[PDB]
Design an enzyme around this catalytic site. Structure first.
Site, short mmCIF file in Angstrom:
data_model
loop_
_atom_site.label_atom_id
_atom_site.label_comp_id
_atom_site.label_asym_id
_atom_site.label_seq_id
_atom_site.Cartn_x
_atom_site.Cartn_y
_atom_site.Cartn_z
N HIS B 36 23.59 -9.76 -21.23
CA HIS B 36 23.36 -9.71 -19.80
C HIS B 36 22.08 -8.96 -19.49
O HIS B 36 21.75 -8.99 -18.31
CB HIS B 36 24.54 -9.01 -19.05
CG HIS B 36 24.69 -7.48 -19.17
ND1 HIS B 36 25.48 -6.80 -19.99
CD2 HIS B 36 24.05 -6.53 -18.38
CE1 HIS B 36 25.38 -5.51 -19.73
NE2 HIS B 36 24.52 -5.36 -18.76
N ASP B 63 28.63 -10.92 -25.06
CA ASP B 63 27.57 -10.18 -24.42
C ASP B 63 26.64 -9.62 -25.49
O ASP B 63 26.73 -8.45 -25.81
CB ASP B 63 28.22 -9.06 -23.58
CG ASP B 63 27.26 -8.46 -22.56
OD1 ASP B 63 26.11 -8.85 -22.49
OD2 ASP B 63 27.67 -7.60 -21.78
N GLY B 141 22.67 1.24 -16.59
CA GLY B 141 21.44 1.52 -17.32
C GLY B 141 21.75 1.73 -18.80
O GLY B 141 20.88 1.62 -19.67
N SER B 143 23.74 -0.14 -20.60
CA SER B 143 23.96 -1.41 -21.27
C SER B 143 23.01 -1.67 -22.40
O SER B 143 21.81 -1.38 -22.32
CB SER B 143 23.79 -2.58 -20.33
OG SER B 143 24.77 -2.46 -19.30
N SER B 159 28.48 -2.95 -23.18
CA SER B 159 28.52 -4.10 -22.31
C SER B 159 28.74 -3.64 -20.88
O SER B 159 27.91 -3.95 -20.03
CB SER B 159 29.63 -5.01 -22.74
OG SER B 159 29.75 -6.09 -21.80
#
EC number: 3.4.21.12
Lengths: 4, 198
Positions: B36, B63, B141, B143, B159
């Site tokens: 993502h 993801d 932030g 991720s 994720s």
């Protein structure tokens, strides 16, 4: 839940 | 730039995510991160300098993504923990109950334990299945950032999770947190990547  | 797990990078001069792990694909340098965070061919910048582009990603469903870097980048077997570093030693998957920490540009380095595996997150975009849940806290932030045991076994990339209005789940007790990460092993075999270790 949310992304990140 | 020196590529270290947990540090910030921007995508197309807009979103921010965190680096998960330094990897190679033959002679090609890259780092794995969350799917993502960018679409294929989006530009990754670290410190305002272009370092590479998204080479592949799957989101939603899974993801995961890897960014191929220019050869001027220095891959390192490390994950940021404040001013110090944790050496990446391999990718043995830890079981439920194991202690684990994670690193990202918004909340830094946080530790907790793995509470469940094969969790589905129902995000606005679609479901992401097969995620592992830990209760280390995290924020927007983070991720793409590293999840690693202190023994240096790389677990996955951040994720998502249950954010509160302050943008993270650090102010709610650990018992109530759901911080979800994508398992590293299927990303490595899917794209034929090898982890940089030290």
């Amino acid at each position: 839940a949310a992304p990140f | 730039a020196n590529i270290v797990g947990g540090i910030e990078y921007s995508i197309n001069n807009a979103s921010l995510c965190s680096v998960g792990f330094s990897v190679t694909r033959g002679a090609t340098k890259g780092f794995v991160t969350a799917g993502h965070c960018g679409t294929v061919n989006a530009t990754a910048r670290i410190g305002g300098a272009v370092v590479g582009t998204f080479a592949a990603r799957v989101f939603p469903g899974n993801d995961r993504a890897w960014v191929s870097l220019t050869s001027a980048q220095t891959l390192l077997p490390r994950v940021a923990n404040g001013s110090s570093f944790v050496t990446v030693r391999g990718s043995t998957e830890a079981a439920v109950g194991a202690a684990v920490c994670r690193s990202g540009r918004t909340t830094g380095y946080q530790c907790g334990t793995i509470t469940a595996k094969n969790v589905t997150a129902n995000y606005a975009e679609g479901a992401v299945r097969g995620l592992t849940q830990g209760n280390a806290c995290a924020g927007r932030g983070d991720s793409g950032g590293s999840w690693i045991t202190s023994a240096g076994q790389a677990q996955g990339v951040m994720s998502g999770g249950n954010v509160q209005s302050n943008g993270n789940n650090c102010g709610i007790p650990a018992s109530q947190r759901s911080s979800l990460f994508e398992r590293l092993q299927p990303i490595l075999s899917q794209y034929g990547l090898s982890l940089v270790t030290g």
